Amino acid sequence: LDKSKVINSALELLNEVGIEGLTTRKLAQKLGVEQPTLYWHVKNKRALLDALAIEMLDRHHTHFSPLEGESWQDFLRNNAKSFRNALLSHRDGAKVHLGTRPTEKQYETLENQLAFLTQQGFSLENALYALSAVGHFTLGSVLEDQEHQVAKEERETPTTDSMPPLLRQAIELFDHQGAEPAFLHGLESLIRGFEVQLTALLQI
Amino acid sequence: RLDKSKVINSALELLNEVGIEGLTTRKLAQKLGVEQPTLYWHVKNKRALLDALAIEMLDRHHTHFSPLEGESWQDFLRNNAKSFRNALLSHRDGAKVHLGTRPTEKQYETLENQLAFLTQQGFSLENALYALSAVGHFTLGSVLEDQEHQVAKEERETPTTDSMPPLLRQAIELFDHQGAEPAFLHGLESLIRGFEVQLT
């Protein structure tokens, strides 16, 4: 009956009910426990969500820190991907991570991210803008994926044979491929946009 | 049928009053001055309401929904994102409302011109798609986070600084000074410069 069982069960519970239907009541039932006893481990539903975010990053965000003589591009690419994995790891995973601030045990890891990017050419400012851009892009991708995943079941089936040519092309494209390709292109796009600034390709 | 009515309008004001969590049948019915069965006739479920609220928000505040006479694809993507941003920021929990948006037939023509315009500028249809998507998802991601941390900060124990290290701290002050918008415009600019350079 420690903090770690509570969190493993919460994670199992998240998969079975999603975030809207996750409650301390249901978690206490899953555990065969009185609601009070659970309170000591999680005060309320947002503390719970913060803890679940933390577990997910900790289990599945394997490229949290830069690495080796890995380039800044490799890091940003590998960091985005790995983060996306964390957000996809559970039902409504992105929504759980949404609006979570890093704890102090995370502060150091954030520090050598910045330091790594500044040691490799970026101003602090641009390093922030770069990390910010990959992060918000990655989160928004997963957030919509997971949301449309849910919505499709709460809606009448789609009126597709009706769409004009290019939009219909797009739709068949999407159906064949899913979301990942879009994610990868947007990710490369960001990295490349920062390459061009850093490279002074378009200067005078 | 929503469009004939004031449900949307009132629901928006309510959304502001109480946020998306608080947008329940009981409170909407009340706000409107009508019992629940009449509201049910207007709207079967919350998703349906959110769909209509999203559209209504775009129709009020997303003014750069298509490319202008003479505009380059770079400027169109810039103005469209910025305009999208504004629409999402125009209401409480505004981005959450737009989450999982399914375009209706009424919107098909706008979407089609977007694609037609980008391909006319020499994107493949496929790469056009990725630029639109990247710009879209980034804009949405940015605002969702902006809005959530806006709410969550109030239920949260103020950044115990000094514990945090040198560059992190500098980054916190920077963000304290400048807010979200400069980071948003720089990120937008990257995406665009990314596609610009692949093009050639």
């Binding site: 928004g140 449309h148 499709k152 089936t157 999407f174 159906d175 899913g178 879009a182 | 979407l111 998507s133």
Partner: peptide, 12 residues
């Protein structure tokens, strides 16, 4: 619009 690839996925 996000142009999300599941915007028109069908149920189940």
């Amino acid at each position: 619009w996000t142009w999300n690839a599941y915007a028109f996925a069908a149920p189940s």
